[PDB]
Each structure stands twice: as C-alpha cells, then as structure tokens.
Amino acid sequence: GLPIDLRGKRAFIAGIADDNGYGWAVAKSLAAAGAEILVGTWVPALNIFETSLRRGKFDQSRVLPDGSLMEIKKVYPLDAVFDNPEDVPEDVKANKRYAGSSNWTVQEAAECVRQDFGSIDILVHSLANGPEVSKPLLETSRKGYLAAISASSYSFVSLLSHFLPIMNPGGASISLTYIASERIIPGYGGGMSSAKAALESDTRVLAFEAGRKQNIRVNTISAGPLGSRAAKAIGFIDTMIEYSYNNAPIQKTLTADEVGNAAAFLVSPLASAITGATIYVDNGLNSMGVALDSPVF
Amino acid sequence: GLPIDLRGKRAFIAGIADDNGYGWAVAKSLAAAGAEILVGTWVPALNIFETSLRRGKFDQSRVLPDGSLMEIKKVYPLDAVFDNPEDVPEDVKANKRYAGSSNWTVQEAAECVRQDFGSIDILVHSLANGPEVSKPLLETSRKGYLAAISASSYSFVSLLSHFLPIMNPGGASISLTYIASERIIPGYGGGMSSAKAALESDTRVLAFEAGRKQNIRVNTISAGPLGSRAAKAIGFIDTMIEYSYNNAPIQKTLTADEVGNAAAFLVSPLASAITGATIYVDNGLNSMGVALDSPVF
Amino acid sequence: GLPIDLRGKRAFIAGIADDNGYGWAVAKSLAAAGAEILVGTWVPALNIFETSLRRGKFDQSRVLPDGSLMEIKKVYPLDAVFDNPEDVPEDVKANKRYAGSSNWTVQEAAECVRQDFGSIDILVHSLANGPEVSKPLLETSRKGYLAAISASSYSFVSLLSHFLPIMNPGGASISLTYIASERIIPGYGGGMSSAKAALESDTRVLAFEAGRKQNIRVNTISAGPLGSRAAKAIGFIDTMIEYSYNNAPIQKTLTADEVGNAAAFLVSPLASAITGATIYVDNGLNSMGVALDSPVF
Amino acid sequence: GLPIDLRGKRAFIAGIADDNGYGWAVAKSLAAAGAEILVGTWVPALNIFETSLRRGKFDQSRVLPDGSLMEIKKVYPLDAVFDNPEDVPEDVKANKRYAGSSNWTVQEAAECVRQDFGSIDILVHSLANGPEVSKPLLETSRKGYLAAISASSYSFVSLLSHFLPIMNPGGASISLTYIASERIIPGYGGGMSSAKAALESDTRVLAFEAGRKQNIRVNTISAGPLGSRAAKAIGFIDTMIEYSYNNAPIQKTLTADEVGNAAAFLVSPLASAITGATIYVDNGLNSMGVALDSPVF
Numbered sequence A, B, C, D: 001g002l003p004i005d006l007r008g009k010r011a012f013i014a015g016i017a018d019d020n021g022y023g024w025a026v027a028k029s030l031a032a033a034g035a036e037i038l039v040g041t042w043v044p045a046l047n048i049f050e051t052s053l054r055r056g057k058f059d060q061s062r063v064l065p066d067g068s069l070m071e072i073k074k075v076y077p078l079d080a081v082f083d084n085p086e087d088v089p090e091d092v093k094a095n096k097r098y099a100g101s102s103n104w105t106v107q108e109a110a111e112c113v114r115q116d117f118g119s120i121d122i123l124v125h126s127l128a129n130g131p132e133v134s135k136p137l138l139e140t141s142r143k144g145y146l147a148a149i150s151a152s153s154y155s156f157v158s159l160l161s162h163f164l165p166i167m168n169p170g171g172a173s174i175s176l177t178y179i180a181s182e183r184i185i186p187g188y189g190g191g192m193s194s195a196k197a198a199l200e201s202d203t204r205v206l207a208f209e210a211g212r213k214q215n216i217r218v219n220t221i222s223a224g225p226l227g228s229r230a231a232k233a234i235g236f237i238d239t240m241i242e243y244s245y246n247n248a249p250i251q252k253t254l255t256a257d258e259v260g261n262a263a264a265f266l267v268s269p270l271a272s273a274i275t276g277a278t279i280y281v282d283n284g285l286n287s288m289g290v291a292l293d294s295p296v297f
C-alpha cells in the first residue's frame, strides 16, 4: 500500500559498464520501481558492455523481484570528462574506441536524450576515476589530482547542468560518495578524497540552485565498501569489507541492492522533503568512535 | 514493483494523542505499508483520544491512499516518564486520570503487549515534553531541565530497553529529533535542545548496543516545523514554518506524510544498511549557511 | 611579544580535587598566564585536598615554567548537583563530610565569591560524575542516567547562570567534553555519552545567551585520554591511551598541559572571535576514519 | 608567563600582496611572537608590493604591540598554480610580469628558501583565486572550476609537499578556509565552495601523512568576513560583514588580528595536541540555526 512508484518516470544512469557496481544496482532498483532506464556507458567500455548484454551475459543480474528481467531502454556512449566536442584532443578523438562511436561528450549525450525522449525525471551519477588513486596526497601530481576532480566531481556539475533543461520539475538526482571526504582513510589517494569532499559540498550547493530553479531535489549517498569478504583480503576494497564487517554497529556485509533500494527511495516522490543531504548506507560504520578489533581491546 | 512492504509486521507507536502530530502520520504510513498498529497514548490524554476515535472524529484523517481507513489494533495508556509501578508518586497515582486506567508504566505496557501479541517488529518514539520550554537556558531550573531530558530522551532508552526482549531480530526503531540539538535556535528552551542532543547521541550508541545484541536498526529523523503558514505568524512554530518556507533550498511547506513516508522507509527491510543515522526531512534547511530573507540581502 | 596575558584576571575553577586531572592543568596554565586562581572542590574531597596542599604534597605539581609555584588564592567547597540550600536532602546535609563545611551549594559558593572578590573573568568547568558509567545504556536506570546529566551537564548551566552576574563582560568560560557524545565509544556508559552531548549543545546555546547578554564567550574542549601508556593496559582509560597512541595522525601521548595550554588560549582576549566552539585537543584522533592497528591491515 | 614563543622559528607565508588581507595579519602575529618572516608574493603583484613596502607605505600596518615594526626578512615571487618550470606556458613565461622575475614556480621557490635559509618551521597558506567566482555552479565551466581548485586547494598540497623536506619536525602549517565548504552560501561561486571543501578534507589527510612522516601538525581556520561595516553594504563581502554582525552569537566585527592571533597559537608548540582540525574564528556564526534578522521574527 506504500510503493516506491516510479512508473511513467524516466532515469538516465551515468556510470554503468558492467553488472558488478553500484550503478547497475541503482538501475535495477529503479527498474523494479517502474522507471524507464537510459544508460550512459564510458566510451572505452561501451563495446564489451553492449556485447555481453546482447549475448545474455547479464541475464541472471537482470532478474527483478518481479521475476521479470530489467530492460535497458537505450545505452548512450559517454565520456563525462568532456563537455563539448571542441574540448576533445584529436589525440583522444583519434583513439579507436572514441573513434568507433559518437555523440559522447556531455553536451551531445544530453541533446540525444532530448531528441530521443524529450525529458527525464531522474539523474543518477555513479562514476569516478582517478589515475593516481594509489598514491598518497603528498605524492600526487597536480594533473593527477585535477583529473580525479574533473572526472569524479565536476562531471556531476556538468551532467546536471546539461540535463537540467530537460528535467521535469519534481525530479531528482543522486550521486555516490564515500567517507574519505570527511575522515582519514589511508589508501584512498590521488585526490579522490578531495574529489568526494567537493562532490558532497556541490550536492548542497546544487540542491539550492536546482531546487530554487526547477524544483529538483539533489542528494548523495555515502556508501560502504561493496562485496562479500575475500578468502584472503588483499587490496584496498577487500580489507575494507572485512574491517567494516568486524567493526560496524551491525555485523553484516553490504550488498549492492541495499544501496540501490536507498537510491530508489531518495529519487521518489516519497522523499519529497529531503534534499542537499548526505545519507549514509554503510551499516552505521561512520558512527563508530573506535575499531572494536583493535588489539588493545 | 518496489513496495515498502511491512505486511505481517507489528509496530508500537509511542506518542499519539490526536491526528495532528508526526506520530499520527508515521502510523498512517506504516498502516499504508501493511503494518499492524499498536498505540501508546499518554494517560492524561487517553480519554479524549479514544472517544474522538470512537465518535469517528478522526475518520477523514484515517483515510489511506488505498481509500480504506487506518485501523488502530489497540490503544495502550502510557506515561513514559515512569518505568515501573514503584516509581510513581501516590501524588500522581491518585490523580483522577492516572486513577482511571492502569498498566501505564513502561515496564507494564511492555508486559501487556507481550501478553497480547507476543512480539513487535517496529518501535516508533514520537514524544517529548518540557515544562520550561519557553525559558532560556540561563533561566531554566535543574528540575525543569531534568524533566525535559527524562521525558524526551531517557523515555526512548526505556522503551527500547523494555521492548527489546520482544522485538524480532531484523526489526527497527525510529525517533524524531530537531536541529536545535546541533545549532542555536532561540525559543526552543527549557533544556529541550539539550534533550534532543542526548536523544541523537543515544541513537548512535543504541544502534551499536541493540545492533550487536539483536540485529535491531536504530535511527532518528531530524524533522522541520510541521504545518502550513499562519495568516499571522505568532508563536514559535508559526514563525518557524514561515522562516523555513522562505529560506529552504526548495520553497514548500512540510506535510506530516513527508515525515511519515521517510519513517516508513527507514523501518523497512529496504533500509537494511542504515542504522545510527540522523536523517534530515526538513526541505534541506539545515544545509543553508545564511537566511535568504535577511534584510542585508 | 605575543603573550597569553591574563594578569589582573580572576578565574574560578570548578572540579579540582587533586593534581592528576585536567582541572589542575588548566589552573596551572591560567596561573602561568597571570590569573588569580579560585578553586571549587567537591565536598567529600575537600579535606584530603586542602591537607595535601598544606603538607606540600603537590609542590612539585605547582611548579610553573617561571620556576615559581602556583598559588591557589582560595579553595571553596562545592557540590554542583545542588543549586540552593533547600535542594539538599537532610540525608546529605547530615553526612559528616557535608556536615563539616558550609556554603557549598552553587548559589552559596557564588555569593561567597561575590562577597570575597566581587567579580571574576573566567569560569572553568572541569567536572563530571556518573554512578552507572560502567553499564551499557540498555542497562542504565533512569536515576543513573539523570544523575550523570545532572552532575555533568546541568552543573555547567547552573554555574554559569549563578556566576554570570559577577562576570566582567569580555570574560569567558570553558568546559571539557569527550568524543563519546558524537561517536560510539563502547565502555563510556551510564548516560555519560548522553551528558557530554547535552554539554556540547548547551555550549552553543549559552554562547548565544551569554554572548548577547554580557559579551561572555563560551567554548568546550573535546579532550583525548589523559596519561602515558600503562605497562599493561587494563581498564577503560589505559586501553584508550594505547589506542590513541597507535591510531592518531601524530603518534604521541597527550599530557595535561597540552589541554591546559589550549584552555588558557581559549579564555584569553587573543581568542576574542571564538565562541560556541568544540575544539579537539586529542592528537587529531577524531579525524581518523579507520584504526591503523586493525588486524585486517 | 605563558607566551606564544616562536623565537628562533622561521615562517614562510604564501599569499601576501598588501596589508589588507589575512596573510598580512598572520605575519604580524607571528612576527610579534618572534618568528623570522619570509613572504611568497604572487608574481603579478610583486612590484607594487615591494615598492609600497620600500616607500614606507605599509609602515603604520607594520607596527607591533611591542611598538616596533614588523620585519619581512625576504619576499619571494611565487605563482602557486605552477609546480615546475616545465609546467609554464610560454604564453605566461612571456608576460612582462612573469618576464621580470624568476624562480617563481613552487619547486623553485622551495629550492631558493633551502639555499637561503636551509629550513623553516611554519608554513602559512593564505591564498585563493577563482576566475568564475561570481557565477553560480550551474553556470561555471569546467576550466573555471578546475582553476579555482588548482589555485585554492592543490596549491596547498604542492607547497606542503615541496617544503616538507626542509621543515623541521615539530613544525606546523595552517591554511584559511570558509564555511561555504559545509553550508550553502549563495554568491561564493565558480567552484570556490568546492575548493574550500577539498582544502578542508586535504587538511585532515595531510595531518595524517605529514604527521606520521615528519611530526608536522596541519590545521585550517574557517574565518568570518573580514572588515568593518560599509556605509552602504553592496557587494558580497560588505553584505556578509553586516549579516554576521547582526546574526552572530556575539555582536561585533572581526578584525584581521583576531585571525592572526588564532593562527599564531595554532602553529606554536602550545598547540601540540591539535592537528587535522577546522577551527572557526567567526564570532560563532557557524553555530547559529536561524538568522535573528529574518523579518519573520
């Protein structure tokens, strides 16, 4: 009697290249709520994505609670680091991948969606990129840092800015952030922490700008590490999954649907009084003041 | 395809005395999602509440989206400032109101629910009280301040503590707070600001205690002022409704269902990864750094 | 050329019973900056304190950088849980300790200082007490919780409220809090976490009330665990000292003067633009997002 | 008896081009505490600065409490948007201003200080720049936004990274931020809000990196609007000065020394337990929950 009803709504999801990330999960959730799904796929990944999708490689991942399979109405190539055609270096233009497709700058993708569907109700940003992520900040170059900011923070400003004209009032956008913006997380380097802090601050500022301008709500979800525990935690994400499992207020893993479900709620009319917010979907880790697994205890 | 499904779940809502507050709205929301509703009504208010309910006075307020009317399975008298019978002063015991009913201490109400239904899945705290609320802190007495804390913060600890034994794991609780705990709001006096700060801190602590103990999630909603604008804003709440309307990132009022809908989501399985959180359902006011209506602008 | 100059200023320090806590350290700091020191000693502790002080037991602890020894102008008995004489139970009045001294309620101590010195410039609150501190919140009684709040949070409101009339404008107060108010710290039980959250919220509210009323600044210091490492960390504080040492942005212990020095700065005219603030003097622990000593790393 | 003693310490202050900003005030404060002052002046401003300094134009501004005048040991040209010579476009290299001086990239200035003095104890960052600051975020270009980030956030990472090798352990750095990073402040556009959020997040991360690496403390001061009230507030800063005056917990203006004094304390040994912190020196504005001057009240 209380459904998250997105029927008749259209969502553009930026950042889906496979079925293993949060982007896929949000899409599944919105599709379960009834939304029409449009996807923005990073150019270099476009081919394998469309092909696997075609060969039925993601079919098990497309199954909705309903039992039916999720439908992706259209996949759009996109490279969110470029706003307009004149911004692309021939160096890039000339790469085979970018060579093989077109209309992938933000301005172009937005015009194609306008031409193809005329309007959208929901904008989901689920992308990030940072070439020097494995370096400490003291060792990150200016180019590396600006690259992280450009792909992970400004890309949101650009997408929203370019899609705003076709977003129906009462619509919403959501992005994904991570706690490294507010607390020290060694290993999340290369200015990615910096980028998440900018994205969260922009979320607030854009809630005011877009809110007053078109009645669009803007929020971000600070998500925990995604996945189940590794047989042998090695690598940044594996160790974080284990750490969160041992140390959160509630001991359990985090599954992608958990984030997808929160996002679906946040972009629905049920969330009408929520905007400019940072919602933690991380098993309550962020609230803990000490690690329960420290050997001192 | 994405419903907030609470069918087969039972909720005990503490703090409903009429249909004009947030308590009523949360109940409506949970009832729309399919939950069985039990209500805790403050002793002195019990009579007029049950009577108006009986005369059909709240019928228009009971209408669910469904078109059907909300059913309150049972109303329990309750006074959350008293944990057990031996805690009550004969002075109180002897008052006609308290005289007219029984089993109203927290320990007693919990045993009655156990006897009557055996278990519950959701605990909603929607109550507060503060005798010196109109006084600045510099003028609030020790008794007044402790009274606000006892009824508005400790009452949550007591309810959760007494109901925990009958809460099915995977269950959840939710309370309502207000921004005066974190920022200065002149006029919210008598230690009520103090009480909301304690309630929010306890929410975090209890998410860990109850989370690890019984897999129960615990969150609080920081709500905005409830109601539409007054013809002539006079009084603390009227002026705050107008201030929020003029100054929030999105200009609109806040209706009770807006909070009820967020609560319904938060206590559902869809919110499984969210606990120890303070969720703002206030049109994004809290994020603003300046009042847009200040005459300097 | 830039001295923290408190010469000609008078400070009343509530909460000194020995030379091992933060209260003693703040007094030392203020005394080094030139302030006249008045002390509020908890009644039951009064005797051993004055006696040890007299026998020269604290002499090594009184040595100022200057080489000279700190002078305590006057020790006042005090019990900050009682505002006025009529508030004391004969049960308490009759105890030998309370029996042996007088003028120890907040209202009385304030009148004595007025009679003795006429005015003060600085108010330091360095006290706390919580009978059920070793119990989890789920096991804390209403009386235990209210007792923690009454002695650890409301006592500040009372002292400030009673001393405000004799505080010279441009004066300041400072209290000590702890991170358990904002983050989950297992082991800081009995409502002490709740009390620290109320104290921090009251700090903000009182900065506005006292600021506008008498140009008095009000801030609180969120301090880390005090002391060097135990040979064998056992007990809440020992383990926390070790945890902070291993996990803070800068690896070192925290000494009492470190907090005393920050307090001296905060109550001086140099801090004229700082009020309603929570200053962390904890080696930057609070900023960390993960424990570096978790075995997963 | 409690002096902020910086005698024998050397400070490099990046961002002084005149005597009207916070940079000048921090320098004055450090000079009053006894530090040897080195200044980093933005290339295009270098000439008028050195000349006015020479003609005694800033003499009244150089007067220390002491009565003596502040001495600037050496002015270094600097452009913090360029890390190394190969990073500069001939387009810039060729401009007369950049043409007239040398050794102004971050790497070069750091080597000159090393050659000239060998080491420093304190690093002060007091600079920012944002070409599109007057535009809302929805209208800011990718280049404009990245430019703000590059000059206002990454410049700090670069300076610290390049000076770290010559900073004596136990040293400290301080930067200046503004609340627009955490709350919505209409008018602080062009990604400057984004840049301040990144700078604050980097402050935390660098407190860990530099703290563990060389025992260097890193903090930032969130300052209020600088200056007294305008006869007619027009322009972003004038209106903000008036707004803060009317709305802060304590009604008064903010003078540059107020910030300079806090900075001097923060970079001194007295602040040894403080790192990764955001200290508000803004008359407590940030704590307010509503504007007292809103017409609704």
Ligand SMILES: NC(=O)c1ccc[n+]([C@@H]2O[C@H](COP(=O)([O-])OP(=O)(O)OC[C@H]3O[C@@H](n4cnc5c(N)ncnc54)[C@H](O)[C@@H]3O)[C@@H](O)[C@H]2O)c1
Residues within 6 Å of the ligand: A014, A015, A016, A017, A018, A020, A021, A022, A023, A041, A042, A043, A045, A078, A079, A080, A081, A125, A126, A127, A128, A129, A151, A176, A177, A178, A222, A223, A224, A225, A226, A237
């Ligand atoms: N994975 C986690 O544990 C976790 C935790 C917190 C936040 N997040 C955030 O969630 C979002 C999704 O990350 P994920 O973990 O699902 O990984 P993912 O690789 O599935 O998602 C990142 C996506 O960004 C896309 N992308 C990269 N550069 C792009 C560009 N220039 N243009 C267009 N698309 C580009 C990739 O193709 C990819 O689909 C990110 O914002 C990430 O920071 C992830």
Ligand SMILES: NC(=O)c1ccc[n+]([C@@H]2O[C@H](COP(=O)([O-])OP(=O)(O)OC[C@H]3O[C@@H](n4cnc5c(N)ncnc54)[C@H](O)[C@@H]3O)[C@@H](O)[C@H]2O)c1
Residues within 6 Å of the ligand: B014, B015, B016, B017, B018, B020, B021, B022, B023, B041, B042, B043, B045, B078, B079, B080, B081, B125, B126, B127, B128, B129, B151, B176, B177, B178, B222, B223, B224, B225, B226, B237
């Ligand atoms: N109304 C608002 O604008 C607003 C904004 C933020 C938060 N809130 C919070 O929402 C909750 C609900 O408030 P509301 O505005 O709906 O008002 P309300 O009067 O409808 O709710 C308060 C309830 O507390 C009950 N109550 C008081 N003392 C009690 C006691 N000793 N034992 C048992 N019940 C007792 C009353 O009977 C009443 O039903 C409170 O926690 C309040 O602080 C309200």
Ligand SMILES: NC(=O)c1ccc[n+]([C@@H]2O[C@H](COP(=O)([O-])OP(=O)(O)OC[C@H]3O[C@@H](n4cnc5c(N)ncnc54)[C@H](O)[C@@H]3O)[C@@H](O)[C@H]2O)c1
Residues within 6 Å of the ligand: C014, C015, C016, C017, C018, C020, C021, C022, C023, C041, C042, C043, C045, C078, C079, C080, C081, C125, C126, C127, C128, C129, C151, C176, C177, C178, C222, C223, C224, C225, C226, C237
């Ligand atoms: N010790 C730490 O590691 C630490 C860390 C953070 C905060 N703090 C805070 O610092 C303050 C000082 O604590 P401390 O550790 O120095 O211990 P302490 O025992 O030296 O200080 C507490 C003081 O409170 C006094 N006191 C207790 N009940 C009182 C009453 N009813 N009336 C008057 N005085 C009373 C005691 O006599 C004692 O002097 C407290 O507020 C505490 O919460 C301490």
Ligand SMILES: NC(=O)c1ccc[n+]([C@@H]2O[C@H](COP(=O)([O-])OP(=O)(O)OC[C@H]3O[C@@H](n4cnc5c(N)ncnc54)[C@H](O)[C@@H]3O)[C@@H](O)[C@H]2O)c1
Residues within 6 Å of the ligand: D014, D015, D016, D017, D018, D020, D021, D022, D023, D041, D042, D043, D045, D078, D079, D080, D081, D125, D126, D127, D128, D129, D151, D176, D177, D178, D222, D223, D224, D225, D226, D237
């Ligand atoms: N002025 C205020 O009210 C206020 C309030 C909060 C924070 N702040 C912050 O205080 C710091 C100082 O600002 P201010 O108001 O004193 O103004 P200011 O103009 O005195 O300081 C900014 C300085 O940055 C320098 N600068 C700009 N681009 C540079 C570059 N590429 N390389 C080297 N130097 C460059 C300028 O030459 C100038 O000296 C900034 O970080 C600002 O954001 C100012």
Ligand SMILES: Oc1cc(Cl)ccc1Oc1ccc(Cl)cc1Cl
Residues within 6 Å of the ligand: A127, A128, A129, A130, A131, A133, A177, A178, A192, A224, A225, A226, A237, A240
């Ligand atoms: O933000 C994240 C946080 C976590 Cl715990 C795990 C993955 C994350 O996502 C990214 C991190 C860095 C880069 Cl370069 C790209 C992405 Cl998608």
Ligand SMILES: Oc1cc(Cl)ccc1Oc1ccc(Cl)cc1Cl
Residues within 6 Å of the ligand: B127, B128, B129, B130, B131, B133, B177, B178, B192, B224, B225, B226, B237, B240
């Ligand atoms: O918390 C509240 C906040 C707002 Cl804006 C309006 C009403 C609120 O609710 C209360 C406030 C004080 C007392 Cl004594 C009782 C209640 Cl129910």
Ligand SMILES: Oc1cc(Cl)ccc1Oc1ccc(Cl)cc1Cl
Residues within 6 Å of the ligand: C127, C128, C129, C130, C131, C133, C177, C178, C192, C224, C225, C226, C237, C240
């Ligand atoms: O607040 C504190 C925090 C820490 Cl880590 C250590 C001691 C503290 O101080 C107290 C804690 C509880 C009680 Cl009952 C009394 C006091 Cl003085």
Ligand SMILES: Oc1cc(Cl)ccc1Oc1ccc(Cl)cc1Cl
Residues within 6 Å of the ligand: D127, D128, D129, D130, D131, D133, D177, D178, D192, D224, D225, D226, D237, D240
């Ligand atoms: O940060 C600031 C905040 C305020 Cl209230 C006033 C001035 C500030 O400083 C700047 C703001 C924008 C740019 Cl482009 C450069 C500088 Cl120095």
